[PDB]
Protein backbone atom coordinates (compact mmCIF):
# COMPACT_ATOMS: atom_id res chain seq x y z
CA UNK A 1 0.00 0.00 0.00
CA UNK A 2 2.87 2.43 0.59
CA UNK A 3 3.66 2.49 -3.10
CA UNK A 4 1.85 5.64 -4.25
CA UNK A 5 4.99 7.62 -3.45
CA UNK A 6 6.04 6.43 -6.93
CA UNK A 7 4.27 9.39 -8.56
CA UNK A 8 6.99 11.59 -7.08
CA UNK A 9 9.78 10.03 -9.14
CA UNK A 10 8.02 8.49 -12.18
CA UNK A 11 8.95 11.65 -14.17
CA UNK A 12 12.60 10.98 -13.31
CA UNK A 13 12.43 7.34 -14.38
CA UNK A 14 10.79 8.50 -17.60
CA UNK A 15 13.61 11.01 -18.10
CA UNK A 16 16.20 8.26 -17.62
CA UNK A 17 18.11 7.59 -20.87
CA UNK A 18 17.69 3.80 -20.89
CA UNK A 19 14.99 2.27 -23.07
CA UNK A 20 14.33 -0.60 -20.66
CA UNK A 21 13.88 1.85 -17.79
CA UNK A 22 11.48 4.04 -19.78
CA UNK A 23 9.39 0.98 -20.67
CA UNK A 24 9.34 -0.07 -17.02
CA UNK A 25 8.30 3.40 -15.88
CA UNK A 26 5.42 3.49 -18.35
CA UNK A 27 4.14 0.06 -17.28
CA UNK A 28 4.40 1.00 -13.61
CA UNK A 29 2.46 4.20 -14.29
CA UNK A 30 -0.21 2.17 -16.07
CA UNK A 31 -0.90 -0.10 -13.14
CA UNK A 32 -0.70 2.81 -10.70
CA UNK A 33 -3.37 4.62 -12.69
CA UNK A 34 -5.54 1.52 -12.56
CA UNK A 35 -5.19 1.43 -8.78
CA UNK A 36 -5.25 5.08 -7.67
CA UNK A 37 -6.78 7.67 -10.01
CA UNK A 38 -5.43 10.99 -8.74
CA UNK A 39 -5.08 14.27 -10.65
CA UNK A 40 -1.38 13.97 -9.88
CA UNK A 41 -1.43 10.59 -11.61
CA UNK A 42 -3.36 12.18 -14.47
CA UNK A 43 -0.71 14.84 -14.98
CA UNK A 44 1.95 12.13 -14.95
CA UNK A 45 -0.06 10.13 -17.49
CA UNK A 46 -0.35 13.13 -19.81
CA UNK A 47 3.40 13.63 -19.54
CA UNK A 48 3.91 9.96 -20.37
CA UNK A 49 1.73 10.16 -23.47
CA UNK A 50 3.61 13.19 -24.79
CA UNK A 51 6.88 11.40 -24.02
CA UNK A 52 5.66 8.41 -26.01
CA UNK A 53 4.87 10.72 -28.91
CA UNK A 54 8.38 12.17 -28.69
CA UNK A 55 10.00 8.73 -28.80
CA UNK A 56 7.78 7.91 -31.77
CA UNK A 57 9.22 10.99 -33.47
CA UNK A 58 12.74 9.86 -32.56
CA UNK A 59 13.31 6.13 -32.66
CA UNK A 60 14.60 3.85 -35.45
CA UNK A 61 12.58 0.84 -36.50
CA UNK A 62 14.26 -2.03 -34.61
CA UNK A 63 14.18 -0.17 -31.32
CA UNK A 64 10.70 1.04 -32.29
CA UNK A 65 9.56 -2.56 -32.19
CA UNK A 66 11.56 -3.20 -29.01
CA UNK A 67 9.95 -0.19 -27.32
CA UNK A 68 6.39 -0.32 -28.62
CA UNK A 69 5.60 -4.00 -28.24
CA UNK A 70 5.58 -3.95 -24.40
CA UNK A 71 4.02 -0.57 -23.60
CA UNK A 72 0.65 -0.85 -25.36
CA UNK A 73 -1.26 -2.59 -22.50
CA UNK A 74 -0.07 0.44 -20.62
CA UNK A 75 -2.08 2.53 -23.09
CA UNK A 76 -5.23 0.51 -22.50
CA UNK A 77 -4.61 0.93 -18.76
CA UNK A 78 -4.40 4.71 -19.27
CA UNK A 79 -7.63 4.67 -21.23
CA UNK A 80 -9.37 2.65 -18.51
CA UNK A 81 -8.22 5.13 -15.88
CA UNK A 82 -8.94 8.45 -17.63
CA UNK A 83 -11.68 8.84 -20.24
CA UNK A 84 -10.65 12.51 -20.42
CA UNK A 85 -7.21 11.38 -21.61
CA UNK A 86 -8.80 9.61 -24.52
CA UNK A 87 -8.51 11.54 -27.78
CA UNK A 88 -4.77 11.92 -27.21
CA UNK A 89 -4.53 8.14 -26.89
CA UNK A 90 -6.47 7.63 -30.10
CA UNK A 91 -4.37 10.18 -32.00
CA UNK A 92 -1.14 8.55 -30.83
CA UNK A 93 -2.50 5.11 -31.67
CA UNK A 94 -3.40 6.13 -35.20
CA UNK A 95 0.00 7.77 -35.69
CA UNK A 96 2.00 4.75 -34.47
CA UNK A 97 -0.28 2.59 -36.60
CA UNK A 98 0.16 4.34 -39.91
CA UNK A 99 3.90 4.78 -39.42
CA UNK A 100 4.28 1.04 -38.85
CA UNK A 101 2.11 0.36 -41.90
CA UNK A 102 4.37 2.62 -43.94
CA UNK A 103 7.35 0.52 -42.79
CA UNK A 104 5.51 -2.66 -43.85
CA UNK A 105 5.02 -0.99 -47.20
CA UNK A 106 8.70 0.01 -47.46
CA UNK A 107 10.18 -3.43 -47.35
CA UNK A 108 8.60 -6.49 -48.95
CA UNK A 109 6.53 -8.81 -46.78
CA UNK A 110 4.26 -11.83 -47.05
CA UNK A 111 1.30 -11.73 -44.67
CA UNK A 112 0.23 -8.32 -46.05
CA UNK A 113 -1.77 -6.29 -43.50
CA UNK A 114 -2.83 -3.86 -46.26
CA UNK A 115 -4.88 -6.65 -47.83
CA UNK A 116 -5.80 -7.88 -44.33
CA UNK A 117 -7.41 -4.41 -43.72
CA UNK A 118 -10.96 -5.69 -44.39
CA UNK A 119 -11.62 -7.91 -41.39
CA UNK A 120 4.13 -17.28 -34.74
CA UNK A 121 7.50 -15.57 -35.29
CA UNK A 122 6.99 -13.06 -38.10
CA UNK A 123 8.59 -9.76 -39.07
CA UNK A 124 8.79 -7.05 -36.37
CA UNK A 125 6.60 -4.46 -38.08
CA UNK A 126 4.00 -7.14 -38.76
CA UNK A 127 3.96 -7.98 -35.05
CA UNK A 128 3.76 -4.30 -34.14
CA UNK A 129 0.76 -3.64 -36.40
CA UNK A 130 -0.98 -6.71 -35.00
CA UNK A 131 -0.32 -5.48 -31.45
CA UNK A 132 -1.71 -2.05 -32.33
CA UNK A 133 -4.97 -3.38 -33.73
CA UNK A 134 -5.32 -5.77 -30.79
CA UNK A 135 -5.02 -2.91 -28.31
CA UNK A 136 -7.58 -0.88 -30.25
CA UNK A 137 -9.92 -3.88 -30.01
CA UNK A 138 -9.29 -4.04 -26.28
CA UNK A 139 -10.00 -0.32 -25.80
CA UNK A 140 -13.30 -0.68 -27.64
CA UNK A 141 -14.45 -3.82 -25.80
CA UNK A 142 -13.45 -2.18 -22.52
CA UNK A 143 -15.42 0.97 -23.27
CA UNK A 144 -18.47 -0.99 -24.40
CA UNK A 145 -18.60 -3.19 -21.30
CA UNK A 146 -17.44 -0.54 -18.84
CA UNK A 147 -20.72 1.40 -18.40
CA UNK B 1 39.85 25.86 -26.93
CA UNK B 2 36.22 25.38 -25.87
CA UNK B 3 34.78 21.98 -26.76
CA UNK B 4 31.21 21.26 -27.84
CA UNK B 5 28.48 21.49 -25.19
CA UNK B 6 26.01 18.60 -25.13
CA UNK B 7 22.51 19.66 -24.16
CA UNK B 8 19.70 18.16 -22.11
CA UNK B 9 17.32 20.93 -23.13
CA UNK B 10 13.55 20.78 -22.91
CA UNK B 11 12.00 19.19 -26.00
CA UNK B 12 8.68 20.99 -26.57
CA UNK B 13 5.82 18.83 -27.89
CA UNK B 14 2.01 18.89 -27.92
CA UNK B 15 -0.76 16.77 -29.36
CA UNK B 16 5.66 17.65 -15.52
CA UNK B 17 4.44 21.09 -16.58
CA UNK B 18 5.80 21.98 -20.06
CA UNK B 19 9.42 21.80 -18.86
CA UNK B 20 10.37 18.18 -19.44
CA UNK B 21 13.42 16.80 -21.24
CA UNK B 22 14.30 13.17 -21.89
CA UNK B 23 18.00 12.87 -21.16
CA UNK B 24 20.38 11.99 -23.99
CA UNK B 25 23.17 9.44 -23.70
CA UNK B 26 26.64 10.79 -22.88
Amino acid sequence: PSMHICLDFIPELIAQPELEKQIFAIQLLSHLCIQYALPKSLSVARLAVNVMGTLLTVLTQAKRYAFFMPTLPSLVSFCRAFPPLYEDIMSLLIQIGQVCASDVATQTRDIDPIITRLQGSMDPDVQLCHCIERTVIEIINMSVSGI
Amino acid sequence: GKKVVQETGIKVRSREYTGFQVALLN
Binding site: E87, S91, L93, G97, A101, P113, R117, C129, I132, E133 | -
Partner: protein, 141 residues
Amino acid sequence: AEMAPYMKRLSRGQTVEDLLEVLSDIDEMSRRRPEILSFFSTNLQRLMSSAEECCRNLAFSLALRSMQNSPSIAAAFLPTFMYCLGSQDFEVVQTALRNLPEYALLCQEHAAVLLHRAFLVGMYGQMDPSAQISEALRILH
Protein backbone atom coordinates in the same frame (compact mmCIF):
# COMPACT_ATOMS: atom_id res chain seq x y z
CA ALA C 1 -50.86 3.32 -51.33
CA GLU C 2 -49.90 7.00 -51.45
CA MET C 3 -46.14 6.48 -51.02
CA ALA C 4 -45.87 3.78 -53.71
CA PRO C 5 -45.33 6.16 -56.71
CA TYR C 6 -42.52 7.96 -54.87
CA MET C 7 -40.48 4.82 -54.32
CA LYS C 8 -41.44 3.64 -57.80
CA ARG C 9 -39.72 6.81 -59.01
CA LEU C 10 -36.86 5.89 -56.68
CA SER C 11 -36.53 2.39 -58.16
CA ARG C 12 -36.83 3.52 -61.78
CA GLY C 13 -34.66 6.59 -61.21
CA GLN C 14 -31.14 6.70 -62.59
CA THR C 15 -30.54 10.44 -63.13
CA VAL C 16 -29.25 12.69 -60.37
CA GLU C 17 -31.80 15.42 -61.14
CA ASP C 18 -34.88 13.24 -60.65
CA LEU C 19 -33.33 11.32 -57.76
CA LEU C 20 -32.44 14.52 -55.89
CA GLU C 21 -35.89 15.97 -56.58
CA VAL C 22 -37.57 12.84 -55.20
CA LEU C 23 -35.20 12.92 -52.21
CA SER C 24 -36.22 16.53 -51.54
CA ASP C 25 -39.89 15.53 -51.68
CA ILE C 26 -39.20 12.63 -49.32
CA ASP C 27 -37.49 15.13 -47.04
CA GLU C 28 -40.73 17.14 -47.06
CA MET C 29 -42.88 14.25 -45.92
CA SER C 30 -40.13 13.18 -43.57
CA ARG C 31 -40.40 16.53 -41.84
CA ARG C 32 -44.12 15.74 -41.88
CA ARG C 33 -44.78 12.31 -40.27
CA PRO C 34 -41.29 10.73 -40.49
CA GLU C 35 -42.51 7.18 -39.78
CA ILE C 36 -42.92 6.32 -43.48
CA LEU C 37 -39.20 5.89 -44.22
CA SER C 38 -39.51 2.16 -43.48
CA PHE C 39 -41.08 1.96 -46.95
CA PHE C 40 -37.94 3.63 -48.32
CA SER C 41 -35.22 1.85 -46.30
CA THR C 42 -33.89 -0.38 -49.10
CA ASN C 43 -34.03 2.50 -51.57
CA LEU C 44 -32.06 4.49 -49.00
CA GLN C 45 -29.58 1.60 -48.87
CA ARG C 46 -28.63 1.57 -52.51
CA LEU C 47 -28.67 5.36 -52.76
CA MET C 48 -26.39 5.24 -49.72
CA SER C 49 -24.17 3.04 -51.88
CA SER C 50 -24.52 5.66 -54.63
CA ALA C 51 -21.69 8.16 -55.09
CA GLU C 52 -23.42 11.56 -55.32
CA GLU C 53 -22.74 14.22 -52.70
CA CYS C 54 -26.20 15.66 -52.04
CA CYS C 55 -27.79 12.23 -52.43
CA ARG C 56 -25.45 10.80 -49.79
CA ASN C 57 -26.01 13.71 -47.41
CA LEU C 58 -29.78 13.36 -47.71
CA ALA C 59 -29.31 9.60 -47.31
CA PHE C 60 -27.53 10.11 -44.01
CA SER C 61 -30.10 12.64 -42.79
CA LEU C 62 -33.07 10.43 -43.71
CA ALA C 63 -31.38 7.33 -42.31
CA LEU C 64 -30.67 9.00 -38.97
CA ARG C 65 -34.25 10.29 -38.85
CA SER C 66 -35.50 6.73 -39.42
CA MET C 67 -33.18 5.51 -36.67
CA GLN C 68 -34.46 8.20 -34.31
CA ASN C 69 -38.02 7.08 -34.98
CA SER C 70 -37.14 3.38 -34.56
CA PRO C 71 -33.79 2.08 -33.27
CA SER C 72 -34.85 -1.46 -34.27
CA ILE C 73 -33.64 -1.21 -37.90
CA ALA C 74 -29.93 -0.76 -37.13
CA ALA C 75 -29.38 -4.46 -37.78
CA ALA C 76 -30.81 -3.97 -41.27
CA PHE C 77 -28.68 -0.87 -41.87
CA LEU C 78 -25.51 -2.57 -40.59
CA PRO C 79 -23.99 -4.18 -43.74
CA THR C 80 -24.69 -1.29 -46.11
CA PHE C 81 -22.92 1.14 -43.78
CA MET C 82 -20.20 -1.49 -43.32
CA TYR C 83 -19.62 -1.51 -47.09
CA CYS C 84 -19.78 2.30 -47.04
CA LEU C 85 -16.73 2.21 -44.79
CA GLY C 86 -15.15 -0.55 -46.87
CA SER C 87 -15.38 1.13 -50.27
CA GLN C 88 -12.46 2.97 -51.87
CA ASP C 89 -13.87 6.10 -53.49
CA PHE C 90 -12.55 8.15 -50.53
CA GLU C 91 -15.87 10.04 -50.53
CA VAL C 92 -18.48 7.69 -49.09
CA VAL C 93 -16.01 6.74 -46.37
CA GLN C 94 -15.55 10.40 -45.44
CA THR C 95 -19.31 10.91 -45.30
CA ALA C 96 -19.83 7.73 -43.26
CA LEU C 97 -16.99 8.75 -40.97
CA ARG C 98 -18.53 12.18 -40.41
CA ASN C 99 -21.85 10.51 -39.61
CA LEU C 100 -20.23 7.68 -37.62
CA PRO C 101 -20.68 8.59 -33.90
CA GLU C 102 -24.45 9.09 -34.04
CA TYR C 103 -24.85 5.72 -35.76
CA ALA C 104 -22.76 3.88 -33.17
CA LEU C 105 -24.57 5.66 -30.33
CA LEU C 106 -27.93 4.54 -31.66
CA CYS C 107 -26.58 1.07 -32.47
CA GLN C 108 -25.12 0.15 -29.03
CA GLU C 109 -24.55 -3.48 -30.11
CA HIS C 110 -22.28 -3.45 -33.17
CA ALA C 111 -20.42 -0.27 -32.21
CA ALA C 112 -17.47 -2.56 -31.47
CA VAL C 113 -17.15 -3.75 -35.05
CA LEU C 114 -17.96 -0.28 -36.44
CA LEU C 115 -15.21 1.41 -34.44
CA HIS C 116 -12.80 -1.43 -35.22
CA ARG C 117 -13.42 -1.06 -38.95
CA ALA C 118 -13.12 2.72 -38.67
CA PHE C 119 -9.74 2.45 -37.00
CA LEU C 120 -8.59 -0.01 -39.64
CA VAL C 121 -9.63 2.48 -42.32
CA GLY C 122 -7.58 5.18 -40.62
CA MET C 123 -4.86 2.54 -40.21
CA TYR C 124 -4.33 1.78 -43.86
CA GLY C 125 -6.07 4.57 -45.72
CA GLN C 126 -4.51 7.96 -45.06
CA MET C 127 -7.39 9.67 -43.32
CA ASP C 128 -7.57 10.45 -39.62
CA PRO C 129 -10.68 9.18 -37.78
CA SER C 130 -9.25 10.04 -34.35
CA ALA C 131 -11.64 12.90 -33.60
CA GLN C 132 -14.74 10.99 -34.67
CA ILE C 133 -13.76 7.79 -32.85
CA SER C 134 -12.93 9.75 -29.70
CA GLU C 135 -16.23 11.62 -29.87
CA ALA C 136 -18.16 8.37 -30.28
CA LEU C 137 -16.44 6.84 -27.28
CA ARG C 138 -16.77 9.83 -24.95
CA ILE C 139 -20.45 9.86 -25.89
CA LEU C 140 -20.55 6.15 -25.04
CA HIS C 141 -18.69 6.85 -21.74
